[PDB]
Design a protein around this ligand. Structure first.
Ligand SMILES: CC(=O)N1c2ccc(-c3cc[nH]n3)cc2[C@H](Nc2ccc(C#N)cc2)C[C@@H]1C
Ligand SMILES: CC(=O)N1c2ccc(-c3cc[nH]n3)cc2[C@H](Nc2ccc(C#N)cc2)C[C@@H]1C
Lengths: 115, 107
């Protein structure tokens, strides 16, 4: 991992906006299949992801490039759409957060430079 | 804008020619596919051909609006299909390319 302009932006602009959002609470920690009573969750979702894990990775300089962090956000949202029923409210919550994610990504610095 | 030209000439071009892109280049035809519930579940259909036409006709006012349409296309696929369907893996592969190319879009 390393520090880059784009990773700084993802941490301080993108994660900042998503973490505090009123729909963020289901995504701040890994899906807990015991707490939720979902014994098939890990049979369907093979790469769990959540914002707490992404945030710790940003804090610990785990990522080498901003695209790696973007892929983790994407996996978090895609797992939600794959696992849940189409009409579940969690899908709407993920959609709302993901639209913010994309809006902020559209304004990320263009060329990635190590700091 | 420079961003929209990049989404058209770089991002869409890379996705469109990919070996997994054929299901996504035109709207889902629910009648031909025998999927009578498709439009009961998916209320905002989206596909690459629609996005490309919008790019060509200067429909979009901002890059994020175009990105939202790509996202809707992929999300619809994940919401409608079974988790184990090959189409879901095809969408995941294309979406990863989409994000990789978006990371280099000019600001
Ligand atoms: C992110 C994701 O896909 N999921 C996820 C993850 C964490 C949490 C959670 C965290 C603390 N508590 N619950 C709840 C859920 C979803 N389930 C519900 C969501 C909202 C409401 C209401 N209102 C009721 C159920 C199930 C689903 C597998
Ligand atoms: C994008 C999307 O979600 N969908 C979508 C759209 C267009 C098309 C299509 C286009 C030409 N022909 N078929 C096929 C499909 C999927 N169905 C299949 C995909 C691959 C294979 C194999 N091998 C068999 C079925 C169903 C699903 C509703």
């Amino acid at each position: 991992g390393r520090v880059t302009n784009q990773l700084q932006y993802l941490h301080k602009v993108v994660m900042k906006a998503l973490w505090k959002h009123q729909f963020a609470w289901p995504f701040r920690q890994p899906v807990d299949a015991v707490k939720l009573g979902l014994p098939d969750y890990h049979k369907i979702i093979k790469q769990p992801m959540d914002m707490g894990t992404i945030k710790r990775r940003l804090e610990n300089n785990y990522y080498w490039a901003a695209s790696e962090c973007m892929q983790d956000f994407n996996t978090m949202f895609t797992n939600c759409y794959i696992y849940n029923k189409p009409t579940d409210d969690i899908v709407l919550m993920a959609q709302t957060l993901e639209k913010i994610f994309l809006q902020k990504v559209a304004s990320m610095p263009q060329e990635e430079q190590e700091l």
